[PDB]
From a paper:
[name] is a nanobody antagonist for the angiotensin II type 1 receptor ([name]), a G protein-coupled receptor (GPCR) that is a central regulator of blood pressure and renal function. [name] directly competes with the binding of small molecule and peptide ligands to the [name] and is active in vivo, reducing mouse blood pressure to a comparable degree as the clinically used angiotensin receptor blocker losartan. We demonstrate successful use of our software on three polyreactive nanobodies, including [name], a nanobody antagonist of the angiotensin II type I receptor ([name]), where we reduce polyreactivity without compromising binding affinity or target-specific pharmacology.
To investigate how the G26D27 T57I65 substitutions alter [name]’s structure and contribute to reduce polyreactivity, we crystallized [name] G26D27 T57I65 and solved the structure at 1.6 Å resolution. The T57I65 substitution is located at the end of CDR2. Residue D2627, found at the N-terminus of helical CDR1, forms a hydrogen bond with the side chain of framework residue N76 in all eight copies of the nanobody in the crystal structure’s asymmetric unit.
Residue numbers in the entry: -1 to 118
Write the structure that this text describes.
Amino acid sequence: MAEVQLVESGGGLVQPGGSLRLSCAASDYIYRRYRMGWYRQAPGKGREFVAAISGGSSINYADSVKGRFTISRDNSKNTVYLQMNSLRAEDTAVYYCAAYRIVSDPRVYWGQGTQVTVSS
């Protein structure tokens, strides 16, 4: 059998113009072959794409974060990072890591989310 685990950290409270760095640590099964993405959801709104990496396609960013957020990964730690710069109040949301491999797995795996609050 294989273990599936996604662990997010790095959320917190900052002011407009501030910055954060989120991390998503994945089990080996997931990290070696799945596309890994960040999504976010504010209360009352739908969940939306932020950025993604790996899984056989190139890095992709949502329009609303291009140039301000940067996704990367460290194979020695099985971890994906989201460097978040120039934060705006409208970036306030729960940020979720997700893993998906649509050619071979009918399941999307989600972390439980980390809260990002941008408030003056």
